[PDB]
Design a protein around this nucleic acid. Structure first.
Ligand SMILES: Nc1ncnc2c1ncn2[C@@H]1O[C@H](COP(=O)(O)OP(=O)(O)O)[C@@H](O)[C@H]1O
Ligand SMILES: Nc1ncnc2c1ncn2[C@@H]1O[C@H](COP(=O)(O)OP(=O)(O)O)[C@@H](O)[C@H]1O
Ligand SMILES: [Mg+2]
Ligand SMILES: [Mg+2]
Lengths: 436, 436
RNA sequence: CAAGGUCAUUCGCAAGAGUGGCC
RNA sequence: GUCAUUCGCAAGAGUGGCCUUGC
């Protein structure tokens, strides 16, 4: 019985599962991703589903649901889970958390098969068996979330021998029991309803190899902690390091961290996701950047430090000489500068003898109370912009923009909206005109 | 013993196998390909290796060999073989053709395992068994090519339980026997040396499931046909439809077709690959295309048909009225024309009453003895260019080119070189400056 | 030497746009 | 309604170019 071999299709079933619902979304607004996965021997992230062998069944079902590339949380979660490592993932709503665990878990089940224990037991007959032993257990806080997880499981278990089931409180136990008795390899459950099934001898967790806690922060908020601990610690479920455990949550309070240390073994912490700073963006042609900078400098207080960012080292030297001949006390720093020359420049800047510092990205990585940060040249990527403006200690950041910075028009626009800053209407216009 | 699981690496092996040699070549000057695969229920081609699940070992070894995407012959051969169909593949030398069969075959062996027959026999001890039963046999005409096939097999069998071996004539039979005695699952062989090995009781073909005849045209020219027939038809090799047979050849003579019908079962025919047409390319700005066309028409003999291709239906109507108001008897045809209007236009064209036909791509698909085809607008792709100029019978083709046609500068340059035509120096110059 | 970003060409993919051809 | 090509944007990869940073 090979579980990696797809079973014959059903045109009827395909339409019910894939025609509508949660098909793929363009996760491009978010593609400028701050994502970090820290842990011992952390498996590297993926850029395509092909970078790991999901298997024939999963790749075909991904093609039916119309996903093309992994979401940023999936880029890390999928290789982490397929390497059989535990995962603590803090990801905001709409990141693709559900598929981030369903895809690797089901892929592993297809490759490994049901295991020796299930074969050694009486095969689930046409009249079923009273008690079922799920290979994988997913815990959810509500019926709504549990049903949504279950629906995605059907899409990814299409043409497989994995039969998903879902049980939730506030419903008829009779339907759920009768649905369980037809086989259950992946179970989605609210905690209270799952405890009832275990007490009734309908569900056994002796062979549960994949445990997922979805929306874990909410489950604690709703008072499900005793049920979860009864499910995991006070029963037959294999312990940490034998089972493969994953916790997903939108927030990371200390209550979730303490639960992670109790439930997860040698795990990876995965996190996905500047408002005390006034930010201005102005259109400036290249030949006008110097004159625009002079007006800002002529408007600066007597004892306010100004940090001016430029793209190239030659541009930094050229801008320093220009400002000096214009009569402005300034200094400069870049990568070619010796450590002594950097110290001399910073000494003048900190002392205030030269309250203007012309710097490349060398000062974006903090070498040291700057009041004004000026992007004389905007950086080529939005990550550099964040590091630059964070040098302020009220704090102001002014950036020069022209057609050369069109590569960050949307990324900069998203940042201004996200930081509750004010948005030039022409920036929105150029963004939509350039991308649609 | 799971054969889909990679075995531990070896830094030495990686360097010896992958550091140099024939790593990937960008099959980019040949992205524009005439490739047709014809046969009953022919599996669709692929565009990346991900489109079929090759397995962890294969995808890992592909990355080490620096292959990015399948070559045009690989796009069809890989899915055809992976679906267990026989293949008659005619492709020129240097097409990525060795890997076109090694990758799907080894992937199948990794997934299917060694089969029941091998598991029921004595394991190859460290004093290995005497007689070997290769799962896959590859036949080559010379030692040189056989070694070259074998070396690629080493790279793709890296970290696998598949052990390749190569035997060829004009060498010490002694080394080959004891290299075989250490185990052999995939065998590369020249026909003469293989016949000897069978007669020694060293090689058994009872379990060979994948038979490959590489450079089959040369093998027949070198007199290997009786040895091949003895190898395939007069021994224990499983017959067609049980074994999976592939034949590769740079040419497709009648002698190869007859051999394919004898050896291949329900096979697919795969083929990969205008000199009596003088072709001219001239730079013409858009505002000058009408004046340039007039000079050519005034230089046309009184009784010669000219076919003028344009991009849009509106362009066809506009060009017709312009020529008419200039005193040139002409007509036009495009997709929006009713069948009656098309017949009227063709009637005037073939009678010579209006020897100038202004047409869109609607006339690029055969509808006469046209003496001059003029690309007033060059098509957006080179395939359309071939179909347009093919309407001549001496026949001449003159094409207008400007910056709008930069998207086919390289493809048109390759075509003119391929068809032994004169090449404007500016066309090469613009091609290299645009792509490098 | 290593690490990062952007651009140009190419390949696939998704969304859009434009042209063409078939009914 | 179906089909083909091109172009814009976006993801990735390969090549090239360019810039930045660390010894
Ligand atoms: N690889 C992907 N590509 C495109 N869209 C995806 C992908 N993975 C998930 N999605 C979509 O993201 C949306 C959110 O799914 P969901 O799991 O509910 O996010 P979350 O659970 O973190 O709130 C769904 O519409 C889903 O189809
Ligand atoms: N998918 C690929 N991507 C890039 N290069 C490839 C690919 N496949 C093969 N090649 C290269 O193409 C060249 C031709 O290999 P070969 O099999 O001998 O062509 P052929 O057999 O048609 O004469 C080799 O250098 C090989 O490494
Ligand atoms: Mg060859
Ligand atoms: Mg092109």
């Amino acid at each position: 019985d090979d579980w990696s071999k797809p079973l014959p299709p059903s045109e009827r079933l395909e339409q019910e599962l894939f025609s509508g619902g949660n098909t793929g979304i363009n996760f491009e607004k978010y593609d400028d991703i701050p994502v970090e996965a820290t842990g011992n021997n952390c498996p590297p992230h993926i850029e395509s589903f092909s970078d790991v062998e999901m298997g024939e069944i999963i790749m075909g079902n991904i093609e039916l649901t119309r996903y093309t590339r992994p979401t940023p949380v999936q880029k890390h979660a999928i290789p982490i889970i397929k390497e059989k490592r535990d995962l603590m993932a803090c990801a905001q709503t709409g990141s693709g958390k559900t598929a981030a665990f369903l895809l690797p878990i089901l892929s592993q089940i297809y490759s490994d098969g049901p295991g020796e224990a299930l074969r050694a037991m009486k095969e689930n007959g046409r009249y079923g068996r009273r008690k079922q032993y799920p290979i994988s257990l997913v815990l959810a806080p509500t019926r709504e979330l549990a049903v949504q997880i279950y629906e995605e499981a059907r899409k990814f278990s299409y043409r497989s021998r994995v039969r998903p089931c879902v049980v939730y409180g506030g419903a008829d136990i009779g339907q759920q029991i009768r649905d369980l008795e037809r086989g259950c390899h992946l179970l989605v459950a609210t905690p209270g309803r799952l405890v009832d099934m275990m007490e009734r001898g309908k569900i056994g967790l002796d062979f549960c190899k994949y445990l997922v806690l979805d929306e874990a922060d909410r489950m604690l908020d709703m008072g499900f902690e005793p049920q979860i601990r009864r499910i995991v610690e006070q029963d037959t479920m294999p312990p940490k390091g034998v089972r493969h455990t994953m916790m997903f949550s939108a927030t990371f309070p200390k209550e979730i961290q303490m639960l992670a240390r109790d439930f997860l073994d040698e795990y990876i912490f995965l996190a996905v996701g500047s408002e005390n700073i006034t930010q201005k963006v102005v259109w400036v042609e290249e030949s006008d950047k110097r004159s625009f900078l002079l007006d800002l400098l002529n408007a600066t207080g007597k004892d306010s430090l100004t940090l001016v960012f430029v793209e190239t080292k030659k541009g930094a030297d050229s801008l320093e000489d220009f400002l000096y001949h214009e009569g402005y006390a300034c200094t400069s720093i870049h990568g070619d500068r010796s450590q002594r020359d950097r110290e001399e420049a910073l000494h003048q800047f900190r002392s205030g003898k030269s309250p203007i510092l012309v710097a490349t990205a060398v000062a974006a990585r903090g070498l040291d109370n700057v009041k004004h940060v000026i992007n004389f040249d905007l950086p080529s990527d939005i990550e550099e912009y964040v590091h630059r403006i964070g040098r302020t200690g009220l704090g102001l950041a002014t950036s020069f923009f022209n057609e050369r910075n069109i590569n960050i028009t949307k990324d900069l626009l998203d940042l201004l909206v996200e930081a509750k800053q004010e948005v030039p209407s022409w920036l929105e216009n150029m963004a939509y005109e350039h991308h649609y």
